[PDB]
């Protein structure tokens, strides 16, 4: 038989090695992991050309359906990143958001240095990036759509090592980057007084985080689709899932 898993390319990244797990073990049924971003998954599960949906974030008022069922397979934190030799050592939401509006152009104004700040983005396909800027309240409504509502002097870097190697390298830059790929190279700050941790994450004392659902009609939902769920709710699965850096709830 066919699963069909469609949404998120944030969850698919992480969705793609669940599904080949669960094949070795029941390999006459394919899980087609289809990665159309959170909203085209929603609308292809409740056209029931999908069988799960998976999102990186959490459904609106309208998308909410009484029989539509949703768990969430786990966290992902983001942290924001200075250069080692920048003293601040936390922001604040107004802080953060008044900086990526440019609204805040120096460090001084936040506690730090004198000195101009380069904010620092990923592309506009960056589903962290989406993530980051629906977190910090950071998009603004034109017409029907939500448009990216960050100074466009903000530069735009390419992945999580470019963003590192950017600020590595810049006194003055700030960015934002997986909690997964910190390293030596960029010190992580707190947002209001949090450390960016797993722990807390998983307690939600660190608010820079977004979640990983799943959703199905459990009632109406057929026999292989339950079997898969059920073992994405696994140890098997969960030891893979903490493995590559994603947080339990
Ligand atoms: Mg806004």
Do not use: C
């Amino acid at each position: 038989s066919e699963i069909t898993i469609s949404g998120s390319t944030s969850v698919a990244r992480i969705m793609d090695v669940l599904a080949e797990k669960y094949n070795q073990q029941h390999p006459e049924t394919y899980v087609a992991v289809q990665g159309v971003g959170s909203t085209a998954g929603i609308s292809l599960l409740k056209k029931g050309v999908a069988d799960i949906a998976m999102t990186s974030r959490y459904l609106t008022e309208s998308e909410a359906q009484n029989t539509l069922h949703t768990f969430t397979l786990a966290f992902d934190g983001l942290a924001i990143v200075v250069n080692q030799a920048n003293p601040v050592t936390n922001l604040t939401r107004e802080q953060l958001y008044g900086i990526y509006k440019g609204q805040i152009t120096n460090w001084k104004q936040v506690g730090g240095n004198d000195q101009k700040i380069a904010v620092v983005t990923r592309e506009a396909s960056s589903g962290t990036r989406y993530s980051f800027e629906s977190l910090m309240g950071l998009t603004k409504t034109v017409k029907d759509r939500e448009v990216s509502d960050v100074a466009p002097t903000a530069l735009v870097v390419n992945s999580n090592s470019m963003m590192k190697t950017l600020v590595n390298h810049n006194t003055q830059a700030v960015g934002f980057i997986s909690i997964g790929s910190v390293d030596k190279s960029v010190k992580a700050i707190q947002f209001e007084k949090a450390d960016p941790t797993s722990d807390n994450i998983a307690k939600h004392t660190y608010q820079l985080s977004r979640p990983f659902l799943i959703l199905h009609y459990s009632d109406n939902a057929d026999e292989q689709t339950k079997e898969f769920i059920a073992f994405l709710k696994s140890e098997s699965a969960k030891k893979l899932i903490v493995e590559y850096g994603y947080i339990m709830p």
